[PDB]
Amino acid sequence: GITGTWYNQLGSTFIVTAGADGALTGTYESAVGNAESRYVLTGRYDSAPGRGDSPGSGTALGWTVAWKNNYRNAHSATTWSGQYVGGAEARINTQWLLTSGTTEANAWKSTLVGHDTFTKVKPSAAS
Amino acid sequence: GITGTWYNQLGSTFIVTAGADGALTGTYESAVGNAESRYVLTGRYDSAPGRGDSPGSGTALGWTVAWKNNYRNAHSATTWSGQYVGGAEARINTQWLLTSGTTEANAWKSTLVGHDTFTKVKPSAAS
Amino acid sequence: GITGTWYNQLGSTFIVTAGADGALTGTYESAVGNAESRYVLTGRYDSAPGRGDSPGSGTALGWTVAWKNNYRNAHSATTWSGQYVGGAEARINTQWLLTSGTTEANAWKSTLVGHDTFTKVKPSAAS
Amino acid sequence: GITGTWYNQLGSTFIVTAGADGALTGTYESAVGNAESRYVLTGRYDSAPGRGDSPGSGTALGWTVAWKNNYRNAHSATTWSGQYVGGAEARINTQWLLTSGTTEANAWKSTLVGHDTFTKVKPSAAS
């Protein structure tokens, strides 16, 4: 379900393997098709999401990307927290926090918040 | 700096190894001293935090815990996003998101937000 | 004449000191006002540009920026070759070469060419 | 790798030190064996050329020589832009721009372009 490639609605993609131990491992590409925009991803997911009181519930998950690779260091990291929903219309609905390293005086403004909806498909076109 | 044990201000602790590749790996113990309250932690940090325009800046990092182990499955995961500050008074200042798997109808209320300040020491007492 | 700040016509600026020995030393800011976009500049200029057969001739100069700093590594370097012209309308007219590190198979396409005209002033506005 | 002496295929040589900060510093000798043909060289190189998407890529670099010393002033400067390739057959493949100071009317013809391939060895013979 979760293993594979995901697209947000803004130009980014990631590939992830969801392992039997609850691990998420992959790569996040902040600009689709840009091979220099790839960063390590790591996280965790609920590997036994079934519940009797709440049937049909999504699968909780989270991951982190530190925005450092051989081409960029934004001295920050994003974490996404969300849930996977399967079915015809599979998606991962998330909220994210991006924290940048700051001086003490600037710590109050170190963290941005946002949201991303990831889908298995996006509109696409031949070149 | 980051490698070691951290305490929040509410009863939890974690141990982490910060590896040369930017990896964070460890275990999160949601109740100090309770060996059944330990969960896998994984994340990322900025392994080259130095900057000329902003000297003295913290080290960005993030990690995830899915709250599933052999004793509990809360069908949720927390991600913490923050920065490490070193020195006499070392700390990791974070914000967190906890997402629970939900039905579609309840997705609007799937995610809690909070904050944690981690320190290397906490008040402690002999038994 | 050359010592000071220069603006190209596209959003970049640099500051340079032209020393009595023919040295150019400074910093290149690829996006004006963006303190994370600053890179070391170094170069040379003709420190005795006067000529009897060609009075009123510009001052030849060149400099290099490798596009590596604490926030970015584009694995490339630009060199600008040009001349300073003084007067009411001072400018540095340049041509540039940007070479990126490539594999052998791609070496044929490692180098871009362009041009930049630098002036001491650009249109500017209050915030 | 880069530090040392380099020969082009036409009679010139230079010596360069590549410093940990990304600096290039040395001397360019436009005629091998002619001690009056030496000029200051300065430049920059990519001090962390490794890339995951492009393994085996060259090292981007550039430098400038203003053609003024105690014996000559050609009222011009050359910049070379290129990449270092290591290995058995080490080389620096470059393109260059030579700009001469000109009057305004002649500015259109102020800049020559060419290419130089530098190697660590050249054919040589006893006297």
UniProtKB/Swiss-Prot annotation, chains A, B, C, D:
Domain Avidin-like residues, every copy: 1-123
GO cellular component entries: extracellular region
Molecular function as annotated in GO: biotin binding
Keywords: Biotin, Secreted, Signal
Major location category of this protein: secreted
Subcellular location, record wording: Secreted
Motif residue range(s): Cell attachment site: 44-46
Binding site for biotin: 28, 39, 80, 96, 108
Similarity-based family: Belongs to the avidin/streptavidin family.
Function, in words: The biological function of streptavidin is not known. Forms a strong non-covalent specific complex with biotin (one molecule of biotin per subunit of streptavidin).
Subunit structure as annotated in this protein's UniProt entry: Homotetramer.
Protein name: Streptavidin
